[PDB]
Design a protein around this ligand. Structure first.
Ligand SMILES: *[C@@H]1O[C@H](CO)[C@@H](O[C@@H]2O[C@H](CO)[C@@H](O[C@@H]3O[C@H](CO)[C@@H](O)[C@H](O)[C@@H]3O)[C@H](O)[C@H]2NC(C)=O)[C@H](O)[C@H]1NC(C)=O
Ligand SMILES: CC(C)[C@H](C)[C@@H](O)[C@H](O)[C@@H](C)[C@H]1CC[C@@H]2[C@@H]3CC(=O)[C@H]4C[C@H](O)CC[C@]4(C)[C@H]3CC[C@]12C
Ligand SMILES: *[C@@H]1O[C@H](CO)[C@@H](O[C@@H]2O[C@H](CO)[C@@H](O)[C@H](O)[C@H]2NC(C)=O)[C@H](O)[C@H]1NC(C)=O
Ligand SMILES: *[C@@H]1O[C@H](CO)[C@@H](O[C@@H]2O[C@H](CO)[C@@H](O)[C@H](O)[C@H]2NC(C)=O)[C@H](O)[C@H]1NC(C)=O
Ligand SMILES: *[C@@H]1O[C@H](CO)[C@@H](O[C@@H]2O[C@H](CO)[C@@H](O)[C@H](O)[C@H]2NC(C)=O)[C@H](O)[C@H]1NC(C)=O
Ligand SMILES: *[C@@H]1O[C@H](CO[C@@H]2O[C@@H](C)[C@@H](O)[C@@H](O)[C@@H]2O)[C@@H](O)[C@H](O)[C@H]1NC(C)=O
Ligand SMILES: CC(=O)N[C@@H]1[C@@H](O)[C@H](O)[C@@H](CO)O[C@H]1O
Ligand SMILES: *[C@@H]1O[C@H](CO)[C@@H](O)[C@H](O)[C@H]1NC(C)=O
Length: 742
């Protein structure tokens, strides 16, 4: 092709982009073979990659300019903010690959039929777009020369759409993916005798199992994420070359059927309803098996013994079934290659046999959490130098004794989780030597002593959770160093001192919970210098002085994102037990069983009966930024409520009860439109209930009793919804639910 042709083809494209600074070095009177994003061979344009650039233009621009370029052999416009839809066009016979993934291409999937113009196209990738389906299957895709086709993450909902894609032939198709859609029906790829890859995962398949025919070439089969309930073994029995089988997250039942093991490297039956015990016939895969996942089923028994021959198994996931017995380590030690071991949420029992130290050198994750082990945590653990182990999850078990200080020898450790045990002693100071550790969790134990000062040596620390222990002393000054700390929780201990003013230096602190301790002193106004704080719980303590009007400055300019994605539990306080205090207890809960929350009965008066909320952390705002939680009840605070309290929109809860807080309820409280709970009881508040609070349309719990309030209760809003008890012991008050104002 003439150089003249090439340059004009490419600059015409630039000259239709809203922002021409996206192709700043694309200029006329310049060989396009020097442009960023262009690839040439022998001075001729052969490929263009403009991915991840917000081109912000419609497909019609690409078809006329780029796809028309004679000689172009590949075009990559992934996440290039392309929109519009496909249509007929002149396609150079040279083009063999076209990647339009992660764009806004729209319209029915039948528009892709016009890509047949590209007589030589073999790789099409329109994933992560918004192409839908007409409604009734009508004809066929008719791109029968393709070898690779990805239609995943579109908006395709239909029946037998697969039959439509392969209607006119798939003799060349080696790779097919249509995951992330809502496609249901039957999958018949038996004529695609060359198919090696088939991903129909996360669809709406609920009837028959895909028909693979001779299945002579298939190496990768992923039908996970549907509602399949069929005899998949019969369909995959002829598959000689299968290397990966992912059927997880379906409605499968019964024991493990026979499987073709000759080539199997990965095998996941997880998140189904398989019963029974791990068959012995699965030994046939130990020659090839690299990853096994049987989690989230109803298997029982113990780790079979033939797993020693599985010398290649890099990961063993067996969690959330009903496996019992002592740690079958006599087998684990032959697993030279094991790097992830997850036996959590079963009923494995017994102590930790001594020979686990040898495996700590090969492993990267050990998860024995939520089982029934017991005895001391092996001190010698991580004696074998070069311990590459990164994650140690031993929580929710029956382990006892001091926390081994040898755990500092695992110098690559990144998360230590020994919560929900019966460990005594102190918190080892050598943990400060864990330079990379980011998560330290030891709550619900019997850990006496003080919080190690040597934690200052941990620059990576992000979460420190030591609730429900016998910890004492003051808050170590050394935590000021842990700049990345975003979740500190020290509730139900005997800690003392004041909140250090250096708490403000933590621009990443989001959750700070110090309830049921013996802290004291005026509330630090420096908390107002916390750019991430959304959860401040200080109930049941001896804090005094007034309340810093400065602590609410960050309202509106918070951005809490580090915190998203962590399992937790919130336990709502009933108004029954007077001993129970505070709005509720937010408590980290990664890898612990909710069924063992009964343990807290010995430390907590709260009657935790069907009042446990959970899930994974999910902050409402991204950068809007306001504090969501704020409890400070059962302290000795006094003074007047600053009008700055009403500056927190995303505030759900607000508990200031059982204090000495005086003055009139600021009229800004009504600006807390998210407020579901508002407690100000047992105080010295006087004046009237500002009519502005009738703007609060989401209040589900409210308590203003035992105060000096006087006057009428707003006839507007949710005040009539609540009972009298929430207003009693305020003689000056009147109005429904109280008596009318005589
Ligand atoms: C996934 O596929 C399932 C079936 O495998 C779909 O469920 C079925 O969806 C249809 C509509 O496509 C429902 O029809 C509606 O049913 C009621 C009578 O129950 C009637 O009010 C309407 O006229 C309409 O026909 C059908 O009931 C429903 N059947 C079930 C759930 O058993 C499902 O919608 C598909 N999508 C998803 C996201 O699950
Ligand atoms: C982002 C992160 C920090 C948090 C933990 C987020 O994941 C959770 O969803 C947080 C936001 C919510 C979980 C449950 C908790 C309580 C549970 C409860 O008793 C409810 C009673 C009534 O129905 C009104 C609404 C209440 C108070 C809600 C308000 C939302 C919560 C705080
Ligand atoms: C096997 O299938 C499961 C379930 O489809 C895959 O796990 C999902 O991974 C995607 C991202 O790839 C996540 O969005 C989902 O949340 C995951 N689901 C669950 C239940 O964890 C898994 O990655 C697949 N593994 C292989 C090797 O294909
Ligand atoms: C998990 O299965 C175990 C056994 O594998 C169950 O606990 C056993 O239950 C049998 C029932 O006959 C008792 O005879 C055994 O004594 C129990 N074992 C022990 C060590 O006490 C257990 O109930 C199952 N779990 C669930 C949740 O169903
Ligand atoms: C791994 O554990 C061994 C044995 O406890 C440690 O070896 C000692 O390390 C200390 C560190 O101050 C030295 O003073 C000693 O001299 C070492 N032992 C001997 C016999 O001299 C080793 O430091 C640990 N490695 C870590 C924690 O990374
Ligand atoms: C706040 O408390 C300070 C410390 O006093 C000690 O602790 C308090 C909680 C009481 O138990 C008291 O008897 C103890 O001696 C006081 O110095 C301070 O004046 C108090 N008030 C204010 C407004 O700071
Ligand atoms: C079919 C089409 O081009 N739709 C929209 C267009 O209306 C809008 O101006 C542009 C903004 O990025 O996004 C695209
Ligand atoms: C304690 O929890 C039980 C659960 O059955 C409930 O029935 C009972 O009313 C609760 N008691 C109090 C005082 O909250």
């Amino acid at each position: 092709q003439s150089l003249y042709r090439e340059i004009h083809q490419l600059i015409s494209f630039k000259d239709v982009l809203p922002d021409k600074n996206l192709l700043p070095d694309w200029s006329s009177n310049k060989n396009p073979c020097t442009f960023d994003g262009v690839t040439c061979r022998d001075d001729k344009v052969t490929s263009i990659d403009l991915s991840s650039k917000p081109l912000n233009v419609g497909f019609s621009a690409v078809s006329s300019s780029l796809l028309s370029l004679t000689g172009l052999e590949s075009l990559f416009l992934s996440n290039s903010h392309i929109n519009g839809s496909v249509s007929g066009f002149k396609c150079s016979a040279s083009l063999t690959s076209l990647d339009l993934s992660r764009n806004s291409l729209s319209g029915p999937v039948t528009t892709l039929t016009s890509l047949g113009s590209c007589s030589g196209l073999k790789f099409l990738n329109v994933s992560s777009n918004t192409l839908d389906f007409p409604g009734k299957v009508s004809g066929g895709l008719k791109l029968n020369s393709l070898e690779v086709l990805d239609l995943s993450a579109n908006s395709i909902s239909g029946a037998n759409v697969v039959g439509w894609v392969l209607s006119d032939g798939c003799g060349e198709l080696k790779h097919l993916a249509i995951s992330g859609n809502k496609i249901s029906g039957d999958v018949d790829v038996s004529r695609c005798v060359n198919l090696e890859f088939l991903d129909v995962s996360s669809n709406n398949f609920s009837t028959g199992i895909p028909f693979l025919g001779d299945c002579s070439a298939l190496q990768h089969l992923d039908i996970s994420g549907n509602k399949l309930s069929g005899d998949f073994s019969r369909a995959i029995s002829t598959c000689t070359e299968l290397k990966l089988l992912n059927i997880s997250s379906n409605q499968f039942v019964g024991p493990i059927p026979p499987l073709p093991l000759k080539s199997l490297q990965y095998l996941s039956l997880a998140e189904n309803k398989f019963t029974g015990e791990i068959p012995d016939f699965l030994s046939g895969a130990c020659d090839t098996l690299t990853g096994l996942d049987l989690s989230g089923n109803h298997f029982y028994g113990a780790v079979p013994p033939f797993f020693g021959s599985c010398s290649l198994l890099e990961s063993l996931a067996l969690s959330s079934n009903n496996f019992s017995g002592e740690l079958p380590m006599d087998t684990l030690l032959k697993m030279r290659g094991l790097k992830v071991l997850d036996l959590s949420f079963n009923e494995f029992s017994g102590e930790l046999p001594e020979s686990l130290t040898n495996l700590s050198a090969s492993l990267l994750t050990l998860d024995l959490s939520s089982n029934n082990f017991s005895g001391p945590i092996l001190p010698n653990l991580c004696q074998n130098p070069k311990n590459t182990l990164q994650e140690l999850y031993l929580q929710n078990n029956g382990f006892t004794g001091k926390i081994p200080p040898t755990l500092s020898n695992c110098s690559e450790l990144v998360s230590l989780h020994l919560s929900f045990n019966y460990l005594s002693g102190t918190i080892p100071s050598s943990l400060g030597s864990l330079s990379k550790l980011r998560d330290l969790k030891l709550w619900l134990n019997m850990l006496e002593g003080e919080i190690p000062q040597e934690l200052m040596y941990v620059k990576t620390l992000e979460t420190l959770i030591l609730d429900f222990n016998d910890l004492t002393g003051e808050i170590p000054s050394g935590l000021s160093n842990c700049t990345n700390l975003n979740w500190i929780s020290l509730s139900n201990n005997r800690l003392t001192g004041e909140i250090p003013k250096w708490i403000g230096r933590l621009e990443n602190l989001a959750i700070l919970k110090l309830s049921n301790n013996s802290f004291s002193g005026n509330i630090p106004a420096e908390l107002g210098d916390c750019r991430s704080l959304i959860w401040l719980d200080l109930n049941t303590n001896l804090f005094n002085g007034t309340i810093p009007a400065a602590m609410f400055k960050q309202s509106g300019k918070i951005a809490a994102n580090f915190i998203a994605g962590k399992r937790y539990v919130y336990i709502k306080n009933d108004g029954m037990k007077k001993e129970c205090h505070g709005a509720g207890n937010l408590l980290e809960f990664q890898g612990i069983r909710s069924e063992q929350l009964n343990r807290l009965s010995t430390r907590n008066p709260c009657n935790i009966t069907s009042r446990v909320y959970g899930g994974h952390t999910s902050p409402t705002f991204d950068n809007n930024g306001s504090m969501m939680f704020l409890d400070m009840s059962y302290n000795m605070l006094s003074g007047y409520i600053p009008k700055e309290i009403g500056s927190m929109p995303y505030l759900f809860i607000l508990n200031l009860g059982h204090n000495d807080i005086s003055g009139s309820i600021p009229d800004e409280v009504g600006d807390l439109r998210g407020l579901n709970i508002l407690d100000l009881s047992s105080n010295k508040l006087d004046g009237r209930i500002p009519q502005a609070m009738s703007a609060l349309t989401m209040l589900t719990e409210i308590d203003l009793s035992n105060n000096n309030l006087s006057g009428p209760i707003p006839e507007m809003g949710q005040f009539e919804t609540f009972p009298p008890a929430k207003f009693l012991n305020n003689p000056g008050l009147c109005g429904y639910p109280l008596p009318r104002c005589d």
